[PDB]
Amino acid sequence: PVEERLEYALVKGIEKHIIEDTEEARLNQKKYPRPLNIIEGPLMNGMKIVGDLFGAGKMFLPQVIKSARVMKKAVGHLIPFMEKEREETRVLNGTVEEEDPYQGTIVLATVKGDVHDIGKNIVGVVLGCNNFRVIDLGVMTPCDKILKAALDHKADIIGLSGLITPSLDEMIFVAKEMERLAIRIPLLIGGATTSKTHTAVKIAPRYSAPVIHVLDASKSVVVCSQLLDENLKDEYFEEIMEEYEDIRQDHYESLKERRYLPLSQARKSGFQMDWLSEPHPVKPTFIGTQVFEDYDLQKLVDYIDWKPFFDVWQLRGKYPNRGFPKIFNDKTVGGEARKVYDDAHNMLNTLISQKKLRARGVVGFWPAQSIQDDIHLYAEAAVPQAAEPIATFYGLRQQAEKDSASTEPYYCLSDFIAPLHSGIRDYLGLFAVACFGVEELSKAYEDDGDDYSSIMVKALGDRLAEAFAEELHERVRRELWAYCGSEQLDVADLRRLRYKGIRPAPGYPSQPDHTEKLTMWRLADIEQSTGIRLTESLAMAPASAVSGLYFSNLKSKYFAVGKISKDQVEDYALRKNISVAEVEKWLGPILGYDTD
C-alpha cells in the first residue's frame, strides 16, 4: 500500500522514501481524485497521530520536529499541484473556494525590542504538527504589523512572545491596541518573563476578548484547540475568566499584606564589611578595555553547559538522571538526549571547522568607589576623592521585610565596593560577549525546510555565548585581574559557582534596571568594539549575547532585590535625575505598590 507507508514515514520521521511514495500516491488518482485528498487523508492522519503522541507524552520534541520536517518535505512536493488546481479553478470558475484543510490560522510574533525566538519557533513547529496554519512574523515585530498580519491572513489566534521584562509593556500595548480597534481575536501570552499572575492582572483586564497565558507548546495546542472548538469556545472562556478573577483578587489582597521597610531603615540594616581587616582589592593588569576579535571556539566547547540545551529540546530527565551527562542513562529520554547531543556535536564541529561562527567580546576594568547605593567609576590617573566620576552604576536595595528569625542584611550591589571615604581603592569590571553568524545559518536552514537544524543552531549559539562568558570570567579571575591567580577548578565547579566573585547582569534580580546597559555600552564602547547592539528595549542583539559587571570581592554573592516601595523609587529617580514615571516603567515588575 501507500497509505501505511506514508503513515510510517511520518511517525518514524524517515526522510528517504517519502518523495517516491508521495509521487505514487499522486499518480493513484483512483484513490485520490484531487491532490488535496492526499493532504487531508494520510498526510494529516500521520501528523495527527504525531501530535496526539506528543500531547500524551509518548513522543518527544525532537521526534516531533523530525516528523514535521518529513511532512513539510511531502507538502513541498504537493504544493505545485495544489497551486495548479487553484489556478485552473480560478480560470474556469472565476473564483477560488474556501478550500483550506487546516484547523485554523495562528499568528506568531515576538513583540518589539525582543530578539529571542527559539521558543516561538518550537511553538510554531508543534502547532504545525497539529494541522494549524502558523504565521511566524519574526522578532521585533511592531504591534501594527501584528494586527495587519492578523487582519490580512484572517488569523483565528494571535500569540505574543517575549523574553525580557521590557517586553511585557509591549504586550500590554498590543492588548490595548486590539481593544481600541475592537478586535475580538483571542490573545495568547508566552515567554520566559511572562507569568500567569502578570497576564491576569496586567494584560487580561485591558482586552475584552480572551487572553490566556500559555506555558509551552504542549499547552498552547490544547488552548488553541479548545478556543477553536465551538462546543467548548465559551465554557472555556468562562473558566478562564473565573480563575483569572480569583487570582486577580488574590494578588490585590496580597498587595495589602506585604510589609516593606523604609529606605533609611533598610540602608541602616544593609550589608557591611570590615574594610580595615578584609584584604585589599587587587589592581587589574590594565585599566580600560581589551577587545577580542576572533575567539577560539574550540576553547569554548569544553565550557558549554548542556543542561539548558537539553531543556530547550524539553528533554527533562527524571531523578536521579536530571542532567548532563547522567541524562543519557535515563530510560525515558536517554535515547533522544543521546541523538540530540550527537547531532549538536556534529554541527558544532562543522561550524567551528568551517569558521561559520565568530565570537567577539570586550572586557574592561576601572577604579570604582561606592557612595551609599551607587558605584562611581573613575579614571586611572585621577584621585577618587577629588575627581568627577566617569560613570555611575545605581544599585537597588532590598526593602521587603525578612523573617524575624533571619539575620540577613538588606543587600545592594554598592555594598560589595569599598566606600569612597574609607581611603581604600577598589575596582569594577564589565564584559560583553556574543556569538555571530547564528542568524544567517538559521535562516539558511529554515529556507531549506530544516527546522531541526535551525533550532539546534540557535541553541548552540546560546550555549557558545554562555561558554564564552564563563571562559572569559575564568580568565579575568586568574589572568586579566589576577585576584584568583592560584585558582584551579573544573567545569563542574564553575557551573556550581564555587569560585570567588560574581558577574551580575543588568536586568537580572540583582539589578532589574535594564537601563544599566546604556552606561556599560557608552563606557566600554561595546557596539564599536564588538558589534553587539542594544535594541530600543535595551535587549542585546544578536540574541546569543551575554554581558554584566565584575565584582571581585570575596563576600560578594548573588541576591534578589525583590519588591521596592515608593520612597526608594523616588530616591532612585532623584539619583538618576529622571522622571519617576520612567523609573516605574523600567522597574515595573519589582514595584511593590499599586500603581493602578
Q: Binding site annotation covers 248?
A: no
Separation between Cα atoms, residue 46 and residue 52, nearest integer Å:
10
Q: Binding site annotation covers 221?
A: no
Can you give the resolution of this entry in Å? 2.8
Domain ranges of the chain: 3-93, 105-254, 264-590
- Among 114, 330, 373, 451, which one carries the catalytic annotation? 114
Q: Binding site annotation covers 343?
A: no
Locate 513 and state its grid cell: 534596571
Cα 155 to Cα 241, 253, 350: the distances in Å are 23, 37, 40
Q: Binding site annotation covers 115?
A: yes
User: Is 105 strand, coil or helix?
Assistant: strand
User: Of 338, 308, 292, 321, nearest to 526 (Cα)?
Assistant: 292
Q: Binding site annotation covers 17?
A: no
Locate 562 and state its grid cell: 525583590
Cα 280 to Cα 40, 426, 553: the distances in Å are 73, 8, 9
Locate 416 and state its grid cell: 560589595
Q: Is 302 a catalytic residue?
A: no
Q: Binding site annotation covers 113?
A: yes
**CATH number of the domain at 105-254, please?**
3.40.50.280
Dihedral of alpha carbons 55, 60, 65, 70, sign: negative
Walk across the sheet containing 187-190 and list its strands. 133-136, 105-110, 157-161, 187-190, 211-213
User: Of 593, 544, 349, nearest to 434 (Cα)?
Assistant: 544
Separation between Cα atoms, residue 433 and residue 454, nearest integer Å:
22
CATH class of 264-590: alpha beta
Separation between Cα atoms, residue 166 and residue 168, nearest integer Å:
5
User: Contact at 8 Å (CB) between 373 and 267?
Assistant: yes
Separation between Cα atoms, residue 355 and residue 349, nearest integer Å:
10
Q: Binding site annotation covers 40?
A: yes
Q: Binding site annotation covers 462?
A: no
Experimental method used, please?
cryo-EM
Which H or E run includes 160? Answer: strand 157-161
User: Contact at 8 Å (CB) between 10 and 43?
Assistant: yes
Q: Is 116 a catalytic residue?
A: yes
User: Of 396, 399, 408, 374, nearest to 563 (Cα)?
Assistant: 399
- β-bridge partners, 157: 106
Q: Is 114 a catalytic residue?
A: yes
User: Contact at 8 Å (CB) between 514 and 164?
Assistant: yes
Superfamily of domain 3-93: Methionine synthase domain (1.10.1240.10)
User: Contact at 8 Å (CB) between 103 and 128?
Assistant: no
User: Contact at 8 Å (CB) between 328 and 334?
Assistant: yes
Which H or E run includes 566? Answer: helix 566-576
- Among 21, 67, 116, 414, which one carries the catalytic annotation? 116
Which H or E run includes 211? Answer: strand 211-213
User: Contact at 8 Å (CB) between 432 and 532?
Assistant: yes
Task: Estimate the share of the chain in helix, then strand, then coil, as percent rounded to the nearest 5.
Answer: 50, 15, 35
Q: Binding site annotation covers 257?
A: no
Q: Binding site annotation covers 559?
A: yes
User: Is 208 strand, coil or helix?
Assistant: coil
- Among 167, 218, 544, 547, which one carries the catalytic annotation? 167
Q: Using omega within 30 degrees of 0 as the cis cutoff, is the peptide bond preceding 101 cis? A: no
